[PDB]
Amino acid sequence: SGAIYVGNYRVVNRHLATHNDWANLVWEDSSRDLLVSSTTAQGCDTIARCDCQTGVYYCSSRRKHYPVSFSKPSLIFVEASEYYPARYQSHLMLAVGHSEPGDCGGILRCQHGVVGIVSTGGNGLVGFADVRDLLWLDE
């Protein structure tokens, strides 16, 4: 689990969004596994606006923050899971690292801010849903 709080927005994995998130929906994309909802309180996270490919992510299944190198956001085939059938997920970045389903929501950050959140994994890989292209999160 996990979320990003920026301005009056809350960014979560679409598959983990609550009834309140869907009731206060701003934008969602199943192909990205992202959902953004509005909030009443101001958040304190800063979204990175950059092309970094190194950062640190939180892995709840290890209670550890791992430094990683990650690929640029791309369209990647993602196997079937409890929440989606087998499909291509867009804006996904991969890294060699540990991840389990419950690790979704873990933040990936670089020197500039939040880059994205854990969204996929398995086989010694971890995939992160990019949020740096969502410029409207800043205003």
Ligand X SMILES: Cc1cccc(CN2C[C@@H](C(N)=O)CCC2=O)c1
Q: Which residues bind ligand X (CB under 6 A)?
A: 15, 33, 78, 81-84, 89, 99-101, 103-104, 118-122
Alpha carbons 107 and 130: distance in angstroms, whole number: 10
- Tell me if 50 is assigned to a ligand binding site: yes
Residue 48's binding partner among Zn ion, ligand X, none (Cβ under 5 to 8 angstroms by kind) is Zn ion
Least distance to Zn ion from the beta carbon of 111, Å? 5
**Residue 45 one-letter amino acid:** D
**Residue 28 one-letter amino acid:** E
Cα angle 118-119-125, degrees, rounded to a multiple of 5:
75
By the rule CB under 5 A, 50 interacts with Zn ion? yes
Structure tokens at 125: 């890989």
Write down the catalytic residue from 59, 103, 104, 130.
104
- Tell me if 59 is assigned to a ligand binding site: no
